[PDB]
Structure 1
Amino acid sequence: STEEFGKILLKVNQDGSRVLLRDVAKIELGGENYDIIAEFNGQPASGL
């Protein structure tokens, strides 16, 4: 899940404050690529 990836500990600062991956990046479930986008009669579609 995005939650588990979000709480990946990158480093602990000198004072003990934690830098998680969600502090340096937005984490979502998205496509391998964003190149190919299909429509069937104008409406959203995928296919093979």
Structure 2
Amino acid sequence: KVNQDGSRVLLRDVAKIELGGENYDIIAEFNGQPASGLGIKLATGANALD
């Protein structure tokens, strides 16, 4: 908004804006060291070792 004054209101003011993390539920520690992993789950009747 703009008020009846001239003073401008923009997101920056009303809210803190940081980039990253769409959800904060799961975090991983590789030997205590912060890390992310790729956990692949198998299909049904696939080809394993291949």
TM-score range, shorter chain: 0.7 to 0.9
Identity across the alignment (%): 100
Query: Which one has a larger percent helix, Structure 1 or Structure 2?
Result: 1
Q: 2-side partners of 1:36 and 1:29: how far apart?
A: 18
Q: What is aligned with 1:27?
A: 17
| Runs of 5+ unmatched residues, structure 1 | 1-10
RMSD of equivalent CA atoms: 0.6
Q: Highest CA radius of gyration, 1 or 2?
A: 2
Report the TM-score, using the length of structure 1 for normalisation: 0.74
Q: TM-score with structure 2 length normalisation? A: 0.71
Name which structure has the greater RCO, CA cutoff 8 Å, separation 6+.
1
CA distance in 1, matches of 2:13, 2:37: 36
How many residue pairs match? The answer is 38
- The runs of 5 or more residues in structure 2 that have no matched partner are 39-50
SS class of match (1:28): strand
